[PDB]
Amino acid sequence: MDIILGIRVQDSVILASSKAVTRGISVLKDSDDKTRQLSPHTLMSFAGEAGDTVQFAEYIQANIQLYSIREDYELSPQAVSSFVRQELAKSIRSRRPYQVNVLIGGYDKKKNKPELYQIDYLGTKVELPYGAHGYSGFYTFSLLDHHYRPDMTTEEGLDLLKLCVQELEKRMPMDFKGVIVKIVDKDGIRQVDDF
């Protein structure tokens, strides 16, 4: 229903997230940004149960920002992903679990490498060249298996992503009202306005 995709290329991580918020038989909003900046070089997209998604995202954001101020230092994408995994892994055996799936795209400044982590609501973490949550993966994974190369540029990554959105717009049942695309690289996080 909620589409969140991620592609790691040579020098950057690209996250695409659907703009629709639907409740019942009404599309309430068509410009929703399903993402939070955790740190200058780390971005988290999210999808799942209503309310839970934003509450979890903002809670993680607050904790990473608190860490940043305390140590005057940015946590690595690997470190942030492990923190997020553990919070979800705690949550799954709570009285009421967070039903939220996330992708974490980051640029590690110490390694000079982009990194993409896929984490589900159970706390199942994997590092991937490309990732998706929900029904989107049933189309995009096979498509990317074919067209993806590890040495692609950011522009090549965006064209590869256009191919995924086109496929989802052709074969998905629901109108998801397009995507907001964001790039994470050595210079930080920026939004592509014309997609």
């Binding site: 140590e71 230092y73 690595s76 690997q78 470190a79 492990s82 923190f83 553990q86 110490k110």
Partner: protein, 244 residues
């Protein structure tokens, strides 16, 4: 009631000092001297054992130098029993950080939390403070080699070379004299032993009254090694520098 028997461990004097903290520091000044020296390619930890008996088992003994994780060690000056309470807390804290972030804990973060625990015993709870001063020697990929000290007040500071316990005033003057920034580990080993040899309250410094440890990048390809010296290795390093 019980008010009668309360020492009030967490109050100020009229001068604005914490009685119990000051008296704990007085306790620590009688404990065996421990020295830390930070070189460009490693760190030395050297400590003097506090009175020996010929019948003390020297090889299977640990009094001064404790391992916190693979990258961080501590030298102790004060009550050993108090130090072991704090060491186990620090060992757990390091593993919590590793479990959470999948990265070894930065040295300062571990030091700050141990120092925050000590601070708590001086502000609330009506208990006596921990009669312990630590020298922390460790490595992380942010700041590289680091030396810190903490004391019963819960105040901590970073050093190039430092001593705790007995005769710190004399020891610090001697370190301040012969220390320079481009120093190597093997030179620092020699400085640490020479300083203890001059400040010791014993007649002569021998292998059986010392604990010694280095933190080098001596293992190949950027991998950090902790070497807690065996008795025979201290005997050899004492001969090699010409103290015995």
């Amino acid at each position: 009631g019980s008010r009668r028997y309360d020492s009030r461990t967490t109050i100020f004097s009229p001068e604005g000092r914490l009685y119990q903290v000051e008296y704990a520091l007085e306790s620590i000044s009688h404990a065996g001297t421990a020295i830390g020296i930070m070189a460009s390619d490693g760190i030395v930890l050297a400590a003097e054992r506090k009175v020996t008996s010929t019948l003390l088992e020297q090889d299977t003994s640990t009094e001064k130098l404790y391992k916190l994780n693979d990258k961080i060690a501590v030298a102790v000056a004060g009550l050993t029993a108090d130090a072991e309470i704090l060491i186990n807390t620090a060992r757990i804290h390091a593993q919590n950080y590793l479990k959470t972030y999948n990265e070894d804990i930065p040295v300062e973060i571990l030091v700050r939390r141990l120092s925050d625990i000590k601070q708590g015993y001086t502000q609330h709870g009506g208990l006596r403070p921990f009669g312990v001063s630590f020298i922390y020697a460790g490595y992380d990929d942010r700041y590289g080699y680091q030396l810190y000290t903490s004391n019963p007040s819960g105040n901590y500071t970073g050093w190039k070379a430092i001593s705790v316990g007995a005769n710190t005033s004399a020891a610090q003057t001697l370190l301040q004299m012969d220390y320079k920034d481009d120093m190597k580990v093997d030179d620092a080993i020699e400085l640490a032993l020479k300083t203890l040899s001059k400040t010791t309250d014993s007649s002569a410094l021998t292998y059986d009254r010392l604990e010694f440890a280095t933190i080098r990048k001596g293992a190949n390809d950027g991998e950090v090694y902790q070497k807690i010296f065996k008795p025979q290795e201290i005997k050899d390093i004492l001969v090699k520098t010409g103290i015995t």
